[PDB]
Amino acid sequence: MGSITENTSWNKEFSAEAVNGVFVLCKSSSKSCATNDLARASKEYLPASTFKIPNAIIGLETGVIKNEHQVFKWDGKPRAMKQWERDLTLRGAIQVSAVPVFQQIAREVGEVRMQKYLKKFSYGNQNISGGIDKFWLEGQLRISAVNQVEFLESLYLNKLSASKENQLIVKEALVTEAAPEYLVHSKTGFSGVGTESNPGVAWWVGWVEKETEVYFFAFNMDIDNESKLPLRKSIPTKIMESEGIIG
Amino acid sequence: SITENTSWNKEFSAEAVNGVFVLCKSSSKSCATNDLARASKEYLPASTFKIPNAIIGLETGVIKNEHQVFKWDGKPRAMKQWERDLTLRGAIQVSAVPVFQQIAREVGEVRMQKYLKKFSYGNQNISGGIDKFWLEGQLRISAVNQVEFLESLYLNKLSASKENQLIVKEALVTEAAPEYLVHSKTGFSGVGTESNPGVAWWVGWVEKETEVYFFAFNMDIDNESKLPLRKSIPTKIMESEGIIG
């Protein structure tokens, strides 16, 4: 990014919901970012299902995922969520955050290749230790909000170390809201409710295309109560609405 | 193969609309329609032509890339919504004719003819002005041919790079929900002349679960107040089939 500046008035939306968290919003043309909290914008947290973005790119690059029309068949064996108990396309698996589909992808990619691509992508602390199918959910991998926006900008510009085709496939799968005047690409994550004195993390990251501008965003918050989960979208939505970008 | 479903006419009769809907599950080899004859009748594509024109612009390099900005020169355009810089998606979404007129001029007649041949696009007749053949010229395409063309695009089987097909696909997203994605494009030739109605279109496809549905709708129109029916009639039919909504 070009610059970052703190805007403490955004804490308004956090205080109203009694949330500890951070929002980073970057405008592409002015190479400028704003955040409610510079310190928290640099703090690093488990990516949880936001990791499906690099995992999908890596799956395609290595040939583990054939293309955007591949169907991931459900075997009929019970899964942790009802929503996952069905055949899924890549978009379907990303959209419902189908953990077991991406655990199998990670296993087939394997540690050496996974390490290589996280280095190429400058993805967080690049620490994948403690189970190839677990690192982004309960392992040692950590990434900051600033690093998420850097990574997403590279994806948007097709500048990651992957084919343009594969970057476009994943970008297509990340669309979550379409309007005549704006398009939103985004991904949620939630690590769980954590333990005593150790909250989980919830994320919403993505980008908005409006007019000829592009805005990259990353939100995270501490969470110890599943009932608070919708705040991961409502707080950043309120901020972007106030900025005139969506709504 | 095209199968008639008489019951779909109820949605047209209610509005006194003359038109056709073609809906195909999985592939263009299995289509349903309210009217066999009109399904294959050819009409001016109007701004549905922005689909092939964007692909051709990318293939020829006239559109340099996914992120090009089409600058407004500050000179009057026929709609205020076109009087601004636009991206490729923005120009498609507001149907910014003058952006695509300049693309067509730079593609040129020789290359435009070549690509419409490769794409099997309607009657492939571009005569009538390189910057207006799809609006007032002799080009004609049917609902069945629109679904075949869209299926090829979906499958990345047009004579174009997969990259360029993917770029145009993203520019066509018009509704995103957890359960389904709609890609689509409208068209409207105008109100026609006496005894010669204009045509309005909505064409596209729906990705739902692991299925895909291709669709094309057209209708005769001679009053702009009827224009919303181009979306509402096919939306009602697709909601009735349980595909969207």
Side-chain angles (χ1 to χ4, degrees):
Chain A
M1 323 316 296
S3 62
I4 190 162
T5 182
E6 194 171 79
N7 183 168
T8 60
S9 73
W10 289 350
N11 284 328
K12 171 196 196 299
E13 302 291 354
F14 292 87
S15 297
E17 306 278 4
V19 167
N20 292 139
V22 66
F23 192 49
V24 179
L25 184 62
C26 304
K27 183 199 273 262
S28 177
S29 66
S30 56
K31 289 282 166 301
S32 60
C33 302
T35 184
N36 62 304
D37 189 335
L38 285 163
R40 189 172 172 116
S42 292
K43 289 182 179 178
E44 307 163 9
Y45 301 94
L46 273 164
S49 293
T50 67
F51 191 72
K52 289 192 171 58
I53 307 176
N55 208 181
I57 303 167
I58 295 164
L60 288 157
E61 270 302 295
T62 57
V64 167
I65 303 166
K66 175 182 168 62
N67 59 34
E68 69 274 32
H69 295 137
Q70 179 179 342
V71 175
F72 298 95
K73 296 287 287 174
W74 174 54
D75 48 29
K77 280 76 176 262
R79 272 171 181 181
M81 305 196 86
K82 180 211 61 53
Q83 276 207 118
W84 303 343
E85 296 183 327
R86 61 178 79 179
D87 296 345
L88 293 160
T89 60
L90 179 65
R91 182 172 192 270
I94 292 174
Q95 177 61 226
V96 301
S97 295
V99 174
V101 173
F102 279 86
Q103 288 182 308
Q104 179 69 25
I105 290 162
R107 288 194 290 268
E108 292 184 45
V109 168
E111 268 210 46
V112 173
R113 291 192 294 195
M114 187 73 78
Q115 193 74 69
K116 178 182 72 194
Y117 282 97
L118 296 196
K119 181 172 185 298
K120 292 175 182 285
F121 294 171
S122 296
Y123 195 90
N125 68 358
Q126 304 175 211
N127 190 150
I128 66 169
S129 70
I132 189 63
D133 55 6
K134 306 187 107 170
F135 61 87
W136 66 95
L137 302 155
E138 62 177 55
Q140 294 307 298
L141 184 58
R142 305 284 187 275
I143 189 170
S144 72
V146 170
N147 195 167
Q148 287 267 24
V149 300
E150 289 173 354
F151 174 72
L152 294 170
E153 176 191 48
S154 295
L155 177 58
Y156 171 82
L157 296 172
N158 309 304
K159 287 180 64 219
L160 295 167
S161 304
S163 76
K164 178 161 169 161
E165 185 169 306
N166 288 333
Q167 290 176 85
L168 286 165
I169 289 170
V170 173
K171 287 150 67 164
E172 158 166 62
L174 292 169
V175 181
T176 56
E177 186 187 356
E181 287 300 303
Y182 69 78
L183 191 62
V184 181
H185 290 75
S186 73
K187 183 77 203 72
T188 55
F190 172 49
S191 67
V193 297
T195 53
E196 293 186 21
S197 293
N198 291 78
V201 62
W203 289 94
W204 194 43
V205 306
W207 64 98
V208 180
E209 294 173 279
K210 193 187 173 165
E211 300 280 4
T212 61
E213 196 49 77
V214 193
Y215 302 88
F216 301 97
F217 70 86
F219 176 88
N220 67 58
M221 62 183 273
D222 297 342
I223 183 166
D224 63 11
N225 177 7
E226 244 180 21
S227 76
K228 306 285 181 193
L229 203 55
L231 296 173
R232 78 191 164 173
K233 296 182 106 91
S234 68
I235 292 171
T237 296
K238 283 182 180 69
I239 299 171
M240 293 187 280
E241 279 173 348
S242 81
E243 296 291 314
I245 300 161
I246 62 183
Chain B
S1 166
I2 304 157
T3 55
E4 206 169 69
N5 183 337
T6 58
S7 77
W8 291 354
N9 278 331
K10 101 272 262 281
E11 300 294 347
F12 295 82
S13 296
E15 316 280 2
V17 169
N18 293 309
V20 72
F21 189 51
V22 175
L23 178 66
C24 319
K25 181 179 194 286
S26 309
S27 79
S28 66
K29 306 200 166 206
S30 62
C31 299
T33 184
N34 60 305
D35 193 74
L36 296 185
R38 192 172 169 127
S40 295
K41 184 162 181 177
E42 302 183 315
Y43 297 95
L44 191 93
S47 296
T48 68
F49 190 70
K50 284 186 172 67
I51 310 176
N53 206 5
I55 300 169
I56 298 164
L58 288 159
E59 281 297 299
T60 57
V62 163
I63 304 172
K64 288 184 180 70
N65 51 79
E66 169 181 5
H67 295 130
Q68 180 167 332
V69 170
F70 300 95
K71 297 294 184 72
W72 180 45
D73 64 5
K75 298 292 185 269
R77 287 173 165 187
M79 304 199 175
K80 217 183 271 299
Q81 62 178 1
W82 302 345
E83 288 180 337
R84 59 175 155 147
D85 293 351
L86 288 160
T87 60
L88 178 60
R89 184 173 185 272
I92 291 175
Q93 297 284 317
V94 299
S95 221
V97 172
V99 169
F100 278 85
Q101 288 180 301
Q102 186 62 25
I103 290 161
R105 295 181 194 103
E106 294 186 357
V107 167
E109 291 144 54
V110 167
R111 294 192 296 194
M112 188 69 77
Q113 180 72 84
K114 177 190 164 94
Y115 281 92
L116 299 192
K117 183 173 303 262
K118 289 188 154 160
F119 292 171
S120 297
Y121 193 89
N123 69 0
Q124 309 174 23
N125 187 155
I126 65 164
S127 72
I130 191 59
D131 63 359
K132 65 192 177 157
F133 61 85
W134 68 94
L135 297 172
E136 64 170 92
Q138 302 311 305
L139 182 60
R140 303 282 184 277
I141 187 170
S142 69
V144 169
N145 198 165
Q146 290 263 24
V147 297
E148 296 172 333
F149 172 76
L150 298 166
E151 171 181 54
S152 296
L153 178 54
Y154 170 77
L155 297 173
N156 308 303
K157 289 177 176 249
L158 293 169
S159 190
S161 72
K162 181 164 170 168
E163 179 176 310
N164 286 335
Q165 290 177 85
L166 287 165
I167 287 166
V168 172
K169 288 192 269 169
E170 195 150 79
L172 293 168
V173 176
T174 55
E175 183 178 4
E179 347 73 37
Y180 65 82
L181 196 52
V182 180
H183 295 76
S184 77
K185 182 75 199 77
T186 51
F188 174 42
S189 68
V191 298
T193 51
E194 182 173 69
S195 307
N196 292 83
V199 60
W201 290 95
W202 191 42
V203 306
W205 69 96
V206 181
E207 295 159 8
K208 188 191 175 180
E209 298 289 324
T210 62
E211 194 55 273
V212 62
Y213 301 84
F214 306 97
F215 71 85
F217 179 87
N218 65 57
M219 62 183 278
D220 293 356
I221 182 162
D222 67 15
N223 193 295
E224 221 157 14
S225 75
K226 301 281 171 68
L227 197 59
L229 298 166
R230 79 193 166 171
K231 287 189 179 182
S232 71
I233 293 176
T235 294
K236 284 186 175 74
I237 297 169
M238 287 188 288
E239 285 174 347
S240 78
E241 292 274 293
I243 296 166
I244 56 175

